[PDB]
Symmetry: D2
Subunit: 45 residues, 4 copies
């Protein structure tokens, strides 16, 4: 899903946390697939 959505949040500290999570959720698709596969393996084992 490539649609973009907007939200607002009250509080600078809350904004900063949500921005970190936004960054992580959006950056995750940039991980090379072989490294994702190696991560998944480590996590179940």
């Amino acid at each position: 899903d490539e649609d973009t959505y907007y939200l607002q949040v009250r509080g600078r500290k809350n904004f900063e946390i949500l921005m970190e999570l936004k960054r992580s959720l959006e950056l995750m698709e940039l991980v090379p697939q072989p490294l994702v596969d190696s991560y998944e393996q480590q996590q179940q084992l």
Copy 2:
């Protein structure tokens, strides 16, 4: 003190909205219940 962000992906948006709500509602939890929570969490370690 209101901040605006956008995120790509409906599922990402839905996660951030759940967290926006919980973080904003935190301001309305009576303080002694926040203190009680920290004490209770000492029993879970």
Copy 3:
């Protein structure tokens, strides 16, 4: 029920712990204040 999670990285842990608290305490906001909050969000 309660569930366990392991996470690598101290900052990551701090973030998840802050979110955990907010998620676990939101049920303790008095209902009249929740009702007021949701009215404001609809606007």
Copy 4:
């Protein structure tokens, strides 16, 4: 040493935290120029 344990009440809360655990852990594996590219792209949105 650098791994931390957390416990959380509620299945839905657990699932939310697990999804974020995964994204936060995986972000360390993004090649740095793609992080830089992401930050540049983000300038077109806000």
